[PDB]
Amino acid sequence: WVIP
Amino acid sequence: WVIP
Amino acid sequence: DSCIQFTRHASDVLLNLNRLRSRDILTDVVIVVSREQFRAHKTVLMACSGLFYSIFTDQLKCNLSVINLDPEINPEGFCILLDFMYTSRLNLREGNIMAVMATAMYLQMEHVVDTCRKFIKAS
Amino acid sequence: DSCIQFTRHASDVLLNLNRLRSRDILTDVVIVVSREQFRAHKTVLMACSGLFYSIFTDQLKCNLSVINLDPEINPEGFCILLDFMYTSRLNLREGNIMAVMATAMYLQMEHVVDTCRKFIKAS
Ligand SMILES: CN(C)c1ncc(Cl)c(Nc2ccc3c(c2)CC(=O)N3)n1
Ligand SMILES: CN(C)c1ncc(Cl)c(Nc2ccc3c(c2)CC(=O)N3)n1
Ligand SMILES: [Cl-]
Ligand SMILES: [Cl-]
């Protein structure tokens, strides 16, 4: 999971 | 396009 | 094999499937959550959820145009997860995280359940 | 928005759609190319091809279970492109590049046409  |  | 690969292909496919959903093109099922109705593509639901995969591989349920979820399922939690299915983006907030995790456990969306557990553990 | 994103989601969705294709689950169209028949999902075809997008948004053609391609289309070229649609992998070889480029131009798959033009220019 990432900060888009 | 890339070499997978 | 000796294939070449187009990096953005999967993302571009998903973006177009979401465009079809937004215009209600070739949607073949309505998911009923309490009073709320959500139109979607069975194939996308199966690709994202262990529960929908089980439902639509069933020889009788594969032909249903309406699926009613358990009355305990929250419509907002479902809406956030349906958006994730079609975009890879999860709108996870303090006010919705419990309903999102419970809905993801019911829908059998393992990666969503994992990030909810981690975010809850941090707080 | 304040969304989080799952990097592998789009690729995982496409991998599952290809698993459904391989097992012939929820396929809703057969594409006829000369004597050869190819089963697929209309939504995936539309998501990958400008030609299929035009065909299945048409109020009459959207309901067809069989689509016949132009007799000039080579079945091997189509097979390679259908595989690309479901995997992001293109089996481009010296012996098939002309048939692949011609099929991609007909199907309106801009990124495939671009890599074929570049590979031909190099040789
Ligand atoms: C497991 N399998 C062969 C398969 N083939 C095709 C599809 Cl569409 C599919 N989808 C599915 C099944 C289980 C789960 C998911 C999708 C997401 C998840 O967390 N569990 N799973
Ligand atoms: C252009 N548009 C709004 C849109 N919405 C939904 C879909 Cl499924 C779609 N697909 C499509 C159209 C044109 C092209 C492609 C897909 C691939 C391409 O090279 N050209 N295009
Ligand atoms: Cl997931
Ligand atoms: Cl393309």
PDB file of C-alpha atoms and ligand atoms in Angstrom:
ATOM      1  CA  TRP A   1       0.000   0.000   0.000  1.00  0.00           C
ATOM      2  CA  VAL A   2       1.234   3.558  -0.936  1.00  0.00           C
ATOM      3  CA  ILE A   3       0.236   7.264  -0.860  1.00  0.00           C
ATOM      4  CA  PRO A   4      -0.750   7.753  -4.570  1.00  0.00           C
TER       5      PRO A   4
ATOM      6  CA  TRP B   1       7.425  -1.366 -22.849  1.00  0.00           C
ATOM      7  CA  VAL B   2       9.907  -3.523 -20.789  1.00  0.00           C
ATOM      8  CA  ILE B   3      11.591  -6.970 -20.658  1.00  0.00           C
ATOM      9  CA  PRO B   4       9.459  -8.635 -17.891  1.00  0.00           C
TER      10      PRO B   4
ATOM     11  CA  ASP C   1       8.848 -16.773 -23.128  1.00  0.00           C
ATOM     12  CA  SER C   2      10.442 -13.911 -25.189  1.00  0.00           C
ATOM     13  CA  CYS C   3       7.432 -11.520 -24.640  1.00  0.00           C
ATOM     14  CA  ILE C   4       7.702  -7.716 -24.086  1.00  0.00           C
ATOM     15  CA  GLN C   5       5.444  -6.083 -21.482  1.00  0.00           C
ATOM     16  CA  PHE C   6       3.433  -2.834 -21.379  1.00  0.00           C
ATOM     17  CA  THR C   7       3.793  -1.548 -17.761  1.00  0.00           C
ATOM     18  CA  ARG C   8       0.594   0.584 -17.726  1.00  0.00           C
ATOM     19  CA  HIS C   9      -1.701  -1.987 -19.465  1.00  0.00           C
ATOM     20  CA  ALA C  10      -3.391  -3.462 -16.293  1.00  0.00           C
ATOM     21  CA  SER C  11      -4.030   0.061 -14.815  1.00  0.00           C
ATOM     22  CA  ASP C  12      -5.427   1.307 -18.207  1.00  0.00           C
ATOM     23  CA  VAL C  13      -7.734  -1.768 -18.418  1.00  0.00           C
ATOM     24  CA  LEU C  14      -9.061  -1.091 -14.868  1.00  0.00           C
ATOM     25  CA  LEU C  15      -9.519   2.638 -15.635  1.00  0.00           C
ATOM     26  CA  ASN C  16     -11.686   1.701 -18.700  1.00  0.00           C
ATOM     27  CA  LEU C  17     -13.693  -0.877 -16.712  1.00  0.00           C
ATOM     28  CA  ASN C  18     -14.441   1.904 -14.155  1.00  0.00           C
ATOM     29  CA  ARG C  19     -15.514   4.229 -17.069  1.00  0.00           C
ATOM     30  CA  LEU C  20     -17.940   1.483 -18.216  1.00  0.00           C
ATOM     31  CA  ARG C  21     -19.277   1.165 -14.632  1.00  0.00           C
ATOM     32  CA  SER C  22     -19.804   4.969 -14.307  1.00  0.00           C
ATOM     33  CA  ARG C  23     -21.821   4.981 -17.603  1.00  0.00           C
ATOM     34  CA  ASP C  24     -23.642   1.726 -16.598  1.00  0.00           C
ATOM     35  CA  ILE C  25     -22.296  -0.084 -19.741  1.00  0.00           C
ATOM     36  CA  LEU C  26     -22.531  -3.935 -19.807  1.00  0.00           C
ATOM     37  CA  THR C  27     -23.186  -4.101 -16.006  1.00  0.00           C
ATOM     38  CA  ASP C  28     -24.899  -7.479 -15.411  1.00  0.00           C
ATOM     39  CA  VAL C  29     -25.730  -7.514 -11.690  1.00  0.00           C
ATOM     40  CA  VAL C  30     -27.194  -5.336  -8.926  1.00  0.00           C
ATOM     41  CA  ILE C  31     -25.819  -5.806  -5.389  1.00  0.00           C
ATOM     42  CA  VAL C  32     -28.466  -4.940  -2.786  1.00  0.00           C
ATOM     43  CA  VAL C  33     -27.116  -3.685   0.586  1.00  0.00           C
ATOM     44  CA  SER C  34     -29.975  -2.776   2.992  1.00  0.00           C
ATOM     45  CA  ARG C  35     -32.019  -0.205   0.964  1.00  0.00           C
ATOM     46  CA  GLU C  36     -29.077   0.652  -1.378  1.00  0.00           C
ATOM     47  CA  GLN C  37     -28.444  -0.765  -4.875  1.00  0.00           C
ATOM     48  CA  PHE C  38     -25.046  -1.000  -6.628  1.00  0.00           C
ATOM     49  CA  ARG C  39     -24.636  -1.938 -10.299  1.00  0.00           C
ATOM     50  CA  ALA C  40     -21.447  -3.766 -11.316  1.00  0.00           C
ATOM     51  CA  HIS C  41     -19.766  -6.302 -13.643  1.00  0.00           C
ATOM     52  CA  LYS C  42     -19.791  -9.876 -12.257  1.00  0.00           C
ATOM     53  CA  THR C  43     -16.251 -10.553 -13.656  1.00  0.00           C
ATOM     54  CA  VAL C  44     -14.748  -7.539 -11.807  1.00  0.00           C
ATOM     55  CA  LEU C  45     -16.536  -8.536  -8.543  1.00  0.00           C
ATOM     56  CA  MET C  46     -15.118 -12.120  -8.893  1.00  0.00           C
ATOM     57  CA  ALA C  47     -11.611 -10.834  -9.698  1.00  0.00           C
ATOM     58  CA  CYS C  48     -11.593  -8.770  -6.431  1.00  0.00           C
ATOM     59  CA  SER C  49     -13.610 -10.821  -3.916  1.00  0.00           C
ATOM     60  CA  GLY C  50     -13.451 -14.423  -2.667  1.00  0.00           C
ATOM     61  CA  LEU C  51     -17.170 -14.180  -1.801  1.00  0.00           C
ATOM     62  CA  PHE C  52     -18.253 -13.054  -5.336  1.00  0.00           C
ATOM     63  CA  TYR C  53     -15.857 -15.590  -6.904  1.00  0.00           C
ATOM     64  CA  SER C  54     -17.701 -18.370  -4.949  1.00  0.00           C
ATOM     65  CA  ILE C  55     -21.177 -16.920  -5.785  1.00  0.00           C
ATOM     66  CA  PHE C  56     -20.720 -16.513  -9.542  1.00  0.00           C
ATOM     67  CA  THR C  57     -18.924 -19.893 -10.090  1.00  0.00           C
ATOM     68  CA  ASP C  58     -22.034 -21.548  -8.639  1.00  0.00           C
ATOM     69  CA  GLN C  59     -24.085 -23.155 -11.466  1.00  0.00           C
ATOM     70  CA  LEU C  60     -27.376 -21.580 -10.129  1.00  0.00           C
ATOM     71  CA  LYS C  61     -26.207 -18.199  -8.723  1.00  0.00           C
ATOM     72  CA  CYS C  62     -24.088 -17.404 -11.873  1.00  0.00           C
ATOM     73  CA  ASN C  63     -27.432 -16.588 -13.654  1.00  0.00           C
ATOM     74  CA  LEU C  64     -28.871 -14.221 -10.989  1.00  0.00           C
ATOM     75  CA  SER C  65     -29.203 -10.505 -11.892  1.00  0.00           C
ATOM     76  CA  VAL C  66     -29.768  -9.487  -8.203  1.00  0.00           C
ATOM     77  CA  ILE C  67     -27.618 -10.462  -5.135  1.00  0.00           C
ATOM     78  CA  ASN C  68     -28.723  -9.479  -1.613  1.00  0.00           C
ATOM     79  CA  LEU C  69     -25.938  -9.129   0.965  1.00  0.00           C
ATOM     80  CA  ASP C  70     -26.259  -9.992   4.679  1.00  0.00           C
ATOM     81  CA  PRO C  71     -28.369  -7.231   6.455  1.00  0.00           C
ATOM     82  CA  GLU C  72     -25.396  -6.570   8.832  1.00  0.00           C
ATOM     83  CA  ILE C  73     -23.407  -5.151   5.840  1.00  0.00           C
ATOM     84  CA  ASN C  74     -23.147  -1.354   5.867  1.00  0.00           C
ATOM     85  CA  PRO C  75     -23.915   0.344   2.433  1.00  0.00           C
ATOM     86  CA  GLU C  76     -21.116   2.939   2.891  1.00  0.00           C
ATOM     87  CA  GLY C  77     -18.512   0.221   3.638  1.00  0.00           C
ATOM     88  CA  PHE C  78     -19.648  -1.653   0.504  1.00  0.00           C
ATOM     89  CA  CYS C  79     -19.516   1.530  -1.650  1.00  0.00           C
ATOM     90  CA  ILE C  80     -15.889   2.245  -0.501  1.00  0.00           C
ATOM     91  CA  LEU C  81     -14.897  -1.362  -1.332  1.00  0.00           C
ATOM     92  CA  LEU C  82     -16.661  -1.346  -4.746  1.00  0.00           C
ATOM     93  CA  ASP C  83     -14.748   1.897  -5.569  1.00  0.00           C
ATOM     94  CA  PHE C  84     -11.472   0.140  -4.498  1.00  0.00           C
ATOM     95  CA  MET C  85     -12.277  -2.849  -6.768  1.00  0.00           C
ATOM     96  CA  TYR C  86     -12.524  -0.552  -9.815  1.00  0.00           C
ATOM     97  CA  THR C  87      -9.678   1.911  -8.970  1.00  0.00           C
ATOM     98  CA  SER C  88      -7.074   0.296  -6.549  1.00  0.00           C
ATOM     99  CA  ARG C  89      -7.830   3.340  -4.257  1.00  0.00           C
ATOM    100  CA  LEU C  90      -9.208   2.816  -0.739  1.00  0.00           C
ATOM    101  CA  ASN C  91     -10.935   5.727   1.080  1.00  0.00           C
ATOM    102  CA  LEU C  92      -9.954   4.549   4.579  1.00  0.00           C
ATOM    103  CA  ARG C  93     -10.905   7.014   7.387  1.00  0.00           C
ATOM    104  CA  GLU C  94     -11.205   6.904  11.233  1.00  0.00           C
ATOM    105  CA  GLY C  95     -15.021   7.095  10.916  1.00  0.00           C
ATOM    106  CA  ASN C  96     -15.350   4.234   8.395  1.00  0.00           C
ATOM    107  CA  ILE C  97     -12.422   1.817   9.158  1.00  0.00           C
ATOM    108  CA  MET C  98     -14.497  -0.578  11.340  1.00  0.00           C
ATOM    109  CA  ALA C  99     -17.309  -0.844   8.693  1.00  0.00           C
ATOM    110  CA  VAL C 100     -14.696  -1.185   5.865  1.00  0.00           C
ATOM    111  CA  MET C 101     -12.772  -4.010   7.687  1.00  0.00           C
ATOM    112  CA  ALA C 102     -16.032  -5.937   8.534  1.00  0.00           C
ATOM    113  CA  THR C 103     -17.260  -5.603   4.892  1.00  0.00           C
ATOM    114  CA  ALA C 104     -13.794  -6.692   3.514  1.00  0.00           C
ATOM    115  CA  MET C 105     -13.810  -9.766   5.836  1.00  0.00           C
ATOM    116  CA  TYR C 106     -17.331 -10.708   4.562  1.00  0.00           C
ATOM    117  CA  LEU C 107     -16.331 -10.076   0.904  1.00  0.00           C
ATOM    118  CA  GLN C 108     -13.033 -12.005   1.450  1.00  0.00           C
ATOM    119  CA  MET C 109     -10.709  -9.186   0.245  1.00  0.00           C
ATOM    120  CA  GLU C 110      -7.524 -10.284   2.056  1.00  0.00           C
ATOM    121  CA  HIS C 111      -5.268  -7.283   1.196  1.00  0.00           C
ATOM    122  CA  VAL C 112      -7.918  -4.750   2.413  1.00  0.00           C
ATOM    123  CA  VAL C 113      -8.417  -6.759   5.682  1.00  0.00           C
ATOM    124  CA  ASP C 114      -4.575  -6.689   6.174  1.00  0.00           C
ATOM    125  CA  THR C 115      -4.245  -2.858   5.808  1.00  0.00           C
ATOM    126  CA  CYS C 116      -7.293  -2.254   8.115  1.00  0.00           C
ATOM    127  CA  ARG C 117      -5.751  -4.530  10.824  1.00  0.00           C
ATOM    128  CA  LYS C 118      -2.407  -2.623  10.534  1.00  0.00           C
ATOM    129  CA  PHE C 119      -4.074   0.849  10.671  1.00  0.00           C
ATOM    130  CA  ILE C 120      -6.173  -0.212  13.736  1.00  0.00           C
ATOM    131  CA  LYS C 121      -3.040  -1.665  15.493  1.00  0.00           C
ATOM    132  CA  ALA C 122      -1.225   1.725  14.991  1.00  0.00           C
ATOM    133  CA  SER C 123      -4.067   3.621  16.787  1.00  0.00           C
TER     134      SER C 123
ATOM    135  CA  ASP D   1      -8.673  12.673  -1.914  1.00  0.00           C
ATOM    136  CA  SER D   2      -6.943  11.064   1.152  1.00  0.00           C
ATOM    137  CA  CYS D   3      -7.082   7.486  -0.349  1.00  0.00           C
ATOM    138  CA  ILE D   4      -4.316   4.826   0.015  1.00  0.00           C
ATOM    139  CA  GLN D   5      -3.444   2.671  -3.009  1.00  0.00           C
ATOM    140  CA  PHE D   6      -2.657  -1.039  -3.481  1.00  0.00           C
ATOM    141  CA  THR D   7       0.127  -1.139  -6.148  1.00  0.00           C
ATOM    142  CA  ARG D   8      -0.540  -4.730  -7.352  1.00  0.00           C
ATOM    143  CA  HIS D   9      -4.389  -4.476  -7.472  1.00  0.00           C
ATOM    144  CA  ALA D  10      -4.785  -3.788 -11.275  1.00  0.00           C
ATOM    145  CA  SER D  11      -2.304  -6.616 -12.195  1.00  0.00           C
ATOM    146  CA  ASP D  12      -4.073  -9.056  -9.760  1.00  0.00           C
ATOM    147  CA  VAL D  13      -7.489  -8.139 -11.281  1.00  0.00           C
ATOM    148  CA  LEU D  14      -6.159  -8.815 -14.830  1.00  0.00           C
ATOM    149  CA  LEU D  15      -4.540 -12.106 -13.712  1.00  0.00           C
ATOM    150  CA  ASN D  16      -7.962 -13.277 -12.337  1.00  0.00           C
ATOM    151  CA  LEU D  17      -9.810 -12.153 -15.491  1.00  0.00           C
ATOM    152  CA  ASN D  18      -7.321 -14.277 -17.521  1.00  0.00           C
ATOM    153  CA  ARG D  19      -7.994 -17.261 -15.136  1.00  0.00           C
ATOM    154  CA  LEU D  20     -11.742 -16.844 -15.856  1.00  0.00           C
ATOM    155  CA  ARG D  21     -11.010 -16.754 -19.623  1.00  0.00           C
ATOM    156  CA  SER D  22      -8.852 -19.943 -19.454  1.00  0.00           C
ATOM    157  CA  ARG D  23     -11.714 -21.795 -17.634  1.00  0.00           C
ATOM    158  CA  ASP D  24     -14.343 -20.218 -19.985  1.00  0.00           C
ATOM    159  CA  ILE D  25     -16.154 -18.583 -16.982  1.00  0.00           C
ATOM    160  CA  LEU D  26     -18.687 -15.776 -17.753  1.00  0.00           C
ATOM    161  CA  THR D  27     -17.331 -15.346 -21.343  1.00  0.00           C
ATOM    162  CA  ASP D  28     -20.169 -13.684 -23.314  1.00  0.00           C
ATOM    163  CA  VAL D  29     -18.883 -13.477 -26.897  1.00  0.00           C
ATOM    164  CA  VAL D  30     -17.105 -15.537 -29.566  1.00  0.00           C
ATOM    165  CA  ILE D  31     -14.804 -13.681 -31.991  1.00  0.00           C
ATOM    166  CA  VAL D  32     -14.643 -15.484 -35.346  1.00  0.00           C
ATOM    167  CA  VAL D  33     -11.384 -15.000 -37.325  1.00  0.00           C
ATOM    168  CA  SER D  34     -11.424 -17.003 -40.607  1.00  0.00           C
ATOM    169  CA  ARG D  35     -12.116 -20.606 -39.406  1.00  0.00           C
ATOM    170  CA  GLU D  36     -10.913 -19.900 -35.811  1.00  0.00           C
ATOM    171  CA  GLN D  37     -13.101 -19.069 -32.784  1.00  0.00           C
ATOM    172  CA  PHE D  38     -11.993 -17.134 -29.669  1.00  0.00           C
ATOM    173  CA  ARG D  39     -14.111 -16.841 -26.514  1.00  0.00           C
ATOM    174  CA  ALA D  40     -13.747 -13.673 -24.423  1.00  0.00           C
ATOM    175  CA  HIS D  41     -15.394 -11.124 -22.086  1.00  0.00           C
ATOM    176  CA  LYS D  42     -16.916  -8.133 -23.939  1.00  0.00           C
ATOM    177  CA  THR D  43     -15.816  -5.707 -21.137  1.00  0.00           C
ATOM    178  CA  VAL D  44     -12.133  -6.765 -21.418  1.00  0.00           C
ATOM    179  CA  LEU D  45     -12.254  -6.487 -25.259  1.00  0.00           C
ATOM    180  CA  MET D  46     -13.735  -2.928 -24.928  1.00  0.00           C
ATOM    181  CA  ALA D  47     -11.165  -1.922 -22.285  1.00  0.00           C
ATOM    182  CA  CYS D  48      -8.290  -2.895 -24.677  1.00  0.00           C
ATOM    183  CA  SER D  49      -9.563  -2.085 -28.188  1.00  0.00           C
ATOM    184  CA  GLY D  50     -11.055   1.015 -29.839  1.00  0.00           C
ATOM    185  CA  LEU D  51     -12.792  -1.286 -32.355  1.00  0.00           C
ATOM    186  CA  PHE D  52     -14.510  -3.468 -29.667  1.00  0.00           C
ATOM    187  CA  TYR D  53     -15.340  -0.342 -27.626  1.00  0.00           C
ATOM    188  CA  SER D  54     -17.227   1.031 -30.709  1.00  0.00           C
ATOM    189  CA  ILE D  55     -18.909  -2.364 -31.434  1.00  0.00           C
ATOM    190  CA  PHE D  56     -20.219  -3.093 -27.934  1.00  0.00           C
ATOM    191  CA  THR D  57     -21.438   0.505 -27.212  1.00  0.00           C
ATOM    192  CA  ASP D  58     -23.671   0.145 -30.279  1.00  0.00           C
ATOM    193  CA  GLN D  59     -27.314  -0.395 -29.174  1.00  0.00           C
ATOM    194  CA  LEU D  60     -27.739  -3.372 -31.635  1.00  0.00           C
ATOM    195  CA  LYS D  61     -24.257  -4.999 -31.634  1.00  0.00           C
ATOM    196  CA  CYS D  62     -23.999  -4.897 -27.764  1.00  0.00           C
ATOM    197  CA  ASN D  63     -26.450  -7.899 -27.736  1.00  0.00           C
ATOM    198  CA  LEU D  64     -24.590 -10.107 -30.274  1.00  0.00           C
ATOM    199  CA  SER D  65     -22.967 -13.336 -28.981  1.00  0.00           C
ATOM    200  CA  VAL D  66     -20.888 -13.783 -32.211  1.00  0.00           C
ATOM    201  CA  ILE D  67     -18.643 -11.151 -33.950  1.00  0.00           C
ATOM    202  CA  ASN D  68     -17.002 -11.931 -37.311  1.00  0.00           C
ATOM    203  CA  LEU D  69     -13.794 -10.021 -38.076  1.00  0.00           C
ATOM    204  CA  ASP D  70     -12.700  -8.867 -41.556  1.00  0.00           C
ATOM    205  CA  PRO D  71     -11.453 -11.953 -43.593  1.00  0.00           C
ATOM    206  CA  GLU D  72      -8.036 -10.204 -44.037  1.00  0.00           C
ATOM    207  CA  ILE D  73      -7.400 -10.634 -40.252  1.00  0.00           C
ATOM    208  CA  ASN D  74      -4.904 -13.391 -39.446  1.00  0.00           C
ATOM    209  CA  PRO D  75      -6.026 -15.802 -36.583  1.00  0.00           C
ATOM    210  CA  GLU D  76      -2.476 -16.003 -35.121  1.00  0.00           C
ATOM    211  CA  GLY D  77      -2.155 -12.181 -34.983  1.00  0.00           C
ATOM    212  CA  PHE D  78      -5.543 -12.013 -33.217  1.00  0.00           C
ATOM    213  CA  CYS D  79      -4.570 -14.780 -30.730  1.00  0.00           C
ATOM    214  CA  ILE D  80      -1.317 -12.900 -29.798  1.00  0.00           C
ATOM    215  CA  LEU D  81      -3.313  -9.672 -29.270  1.00  0.00           C
ATOM    216  CA  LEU D  82      -6.073 -11.394 -27.225  1.00  0.00           C
ATOM    217  CA  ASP D  83      -3.305 -12.872 -24.986  1.00  0.00           C
ATOM    218  CA  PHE D  84      -1.820  -9.319 -24.617  1.00  0.00           C
ATOM    219  CA  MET D  85      -5.260  -7.931 -23.631  1.00  0.00           C
ATOM    220  CA  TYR D  86      -5.504 -10.413 -20.732  1.00  0.00           C
ATOM    221  CA  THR D  87      -1.816 -10.412 -19.601  1.00  0.00           C
ATOM    222  CA  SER D  88       0.001  -7.129 -20.684  1.00  0.00           C
ATOM    223  CA  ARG D  89       2.517  -9.510 -22.444  1.00  0.00           C
ATOM    224  CA  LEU D  90       3.065  -9.299 -26.214  1.00  0.00           C
ATOM    225  CA  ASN D  91       4.664 -12.258 -28.072  1.00  0.00           C
ATOM    226  CA  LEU D  92       6.269 -10.105 -30.788  1.00  0.00           C
ATOM    227  CA  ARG D  93       8.562 -12.064 -33.190  1.00  0.00           C
ATOM    228  CA  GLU D  94      10.194 -11.451 -36.634  1.00  0.00           C
ATOM    229  CA  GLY D  95       7.785 -13.990 -38.200  1.00  0.00           C
ATOM    230  CA  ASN D  96       4.596 -12.456 -36.743  1.00  0.00           C
ATOM    231  CA  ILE D  97       5.310  -8.665 -36.403  1.00  0.00           C
ATOM    232  CA  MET D  98       3.627  -7.687 -39.723  1.00  0.00           C
ATOM    233  CA  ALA D  99       0.420  -9.692 -38.896  1.00  0.00           C
ATOM    234  CA  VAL D 100       0.449  -8.355 -35.269  1.00  0.00           C
ATOM    235  CA  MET D 101       0.809  -4.668 -36.400  1.00  0.00           C
ATOM    236  CA  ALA D 102      -1.979  -5.021 -39.076  1.00  0.00           C
ATOM    237  CA  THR D 103      -4.323  -6.702 -36.515  1.00  0.00           C
ATOM    238  CA  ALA D 104      -3.511  -4.000 -33.843  1.00  0.00           C
ATOM    239  CA  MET D 105      -4.262  -1.215 -36.396  1.00  0.00           C
ATOM    240  CA  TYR D 106      -7.650  -2.880 -37.212  1.00  0.00           C
ATOM    241  CA  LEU D 107      -8.436  -3.430 -33.490  1.00  0.00           C
ATOM    242  CA  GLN D 108      -7.299   0.171 -32.694  1.00  0.00           C
ATOM    243  CA  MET D 109      -4.722  -0.800 -30.007  1.00  0.00           C
ATOM    244  CA  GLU D 110      -2.527   2.327 -30.191  1.00  0.00           C
ATOM    245  CA  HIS D 111       0.287   1.238 -27.798  1.00  0.00           C
ATOM    246  CA  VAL D 112       0.787  -2.106 -29.665  1.00  0.00           C
ATOM    247  CA  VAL D 113       0.851  -0.260 -33.065  1.00  0.00           C
ATOM    248  CA  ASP D 114       3.522   2.126 -31.588  1.00  0.00           C
ATOM    249  CA  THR D 115       5.889  -0.688 -30.406  1.00  0.00           C
ATOM    250  CA  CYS D 116       5.496  -2.590 -33.753  1.00  0.00           C
ATOM    251  CA  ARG D 117       6.391   0.605 -35.726  1.00  0.00           C
ATOM    252  CA  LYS D 118       9.492   1.128 -33.486  1.00  0.00           C
ATOM    253  CA  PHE D 119      10.646  -2.537 -33.778  1.00  0.00           C
ATOM    254  CA  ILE D 120      10.196  -2.437 -37.614  1.00  0.00           C
ATOM    255  CA  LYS D 121      12.115   0.922 -37.843  1.00  0.00           C
ATOM    256  CA  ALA D 122      15.069  -0.670 -35.899  1.00  0.00           C
ATOM    257  CA  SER D 123      15.343  -3.535 -38.471  1.00  0.00           C
TER     258      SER D 123
HETATM  259  C1  LIG E   1      -8.487 -18.748  -6.712  1.00  0.00           C
HETATM  260  N1  LIG E   1      -8.753 -18.670  -8.193  1.00  0.00           N
HETATM  261  C2  LIG E   1      -8.255 -19.819  -9.013  1.00  0.00           C
HETATM  262  C3  LIG E   1      -9.421 -17.555  -8.794  1.00  0.00           C
HETATM  263  N2  LIG E   1      -9.669 -17.561 -10.159  1.00  0.00           N
HETATM  264  C4  LIG E   1     -10.414 -16.562 -10.660  1.00  0.00           C
HETATM  265  C5  LIG E   1     -10.913 -15.553  -9.855  1.00  0.00           C
HETATM  266 CL1  LIG E   1     -11.882 -14.394 -10.516  1.00  0.00          CL
HETATM  267  C6  LIG E   1     -10.599 -15.573  -8.455  1.00  0.00           C
HETATM  268  N3  LIG E   1     -10.913 -14.528  -7.640  1.00  0.00           N
HETATM  269  C7  LIG E   1     -10.803 -14.447  -6.216  1.00  0.00           C
HETATM  270  C8  LIG E   1     -10.789 -15.552  -5.323  1.00  0.00           C
HETATM  271  C9  LIG E   1     -10.394 -15.419  -3.976  1.00  0.00           C
HETATM  272  C10 LIG E   1      -9.996 -14.133  -3.540  1.00  0.00           C
HETATM  273  C11 LIG E   1      -9.999 -13.007  -4.417  1.00  0.00           C
HETATM  274  C12 LIG E   1     -10.399 -13.127  -5.753  1.00  0.00           C
HETATM  275  C13 LIG E   1      -9.523 -11.794  -3.661  1.00  0.00           C
HETATM  276  C14 LIG E   1      -9.218 -12.366  -2.262  1.00  0.00           C
HETATM  277  O1  LIG E   1      -8.750 -11.793  -1.284  1.00  0.00           O
HETATM  278  N4  LIG E   1      -9.535 -13.745  -2.262  1.00  0.00           N
HETATM  279  N5  LIG E   1      -9.854 -16.572  -7.940  1.00  0.00           N
HETATM  280  C1  LIG E   2     -12.599   6.630 -24.760  1.00  0.00           C
HETATM  281  N1  LIG E   2     -13.443   6.133 -23.615  1.00  0.00           N
HETATM  282  C2  LIG E   2     -14.238   7.171 -22.884  1.00  0.00           C
HETATM  283  C3  LIG E   2     -13.471   4.755 -23.224  1.00  0.00           C
HETATM  284  N2  LIG E   2     -14.298   4.356 -22.184  1.00  0.00           N
HETATM  285  C4  LIG E   2     -14.396   3.040 -21.938  1.00  0.00           C
HETATM  286  C5  LIG E   2     -13.694   2.107 -22.682  1.00  0.00           C
HETATM  287 CL1  LIG E   2     -13.911   0.500 -22.379  1.00  0.00          CL
HETATM  288  C6  LIG E   2     -12.825   2.573 -23.724  1.00  0.00           C
HETATM  289  N3  LIG E   2     -11.981   1.727 -24.379  1.00  0.00           N
HETATM  290  C7  LIG E   2     -11.165   1.996 -25.522  1.00  0.00           C
HETATM  291  C8  LIG E   2     -11.394   3.020 -26.481  1.00  0.00           C
HETATM  292  C9  LIG E   2     -10.407   3.408 -27.410  1.00  0.00           C
HETATM  293  C10 LIG E   2      -9.160   2.742 -27.349  1.00  0.00           C
HETATM  294  C11 LIG E   2      -8.903   1.712 -26.395  1.00  0.00           C
HETATM  295  C12 LIG E   2      -9.880   1.313 -25.475  1.00  0.00           C
HETATM  296  C13 LIG E   2      -7.495   1.210 -26.581  1.00  0.00           C
HETATM  297  C14 LIG E   2      -6.970   2.095 -27.729  1.00  0.00           C
HETATM  298  O1  LIG E   2      -5.849   2.121 -28.226  1.00  0.00           O
HETATM  299  N4  LIG E   2      -8.010   2.962 -28.139  1.00  0.00           N
HETATM  300  N5  LIG E   2     -12.720   3.893 -23.982  1.00  0.00           N
HETATM  301 CL    CL E   3      -8.010  -7.067  -1.572  1.00  0.00          CL
HETATM  302 CL    CL E   4      -2.641  -1.116 -26.744  1.00  0.00          CL
END
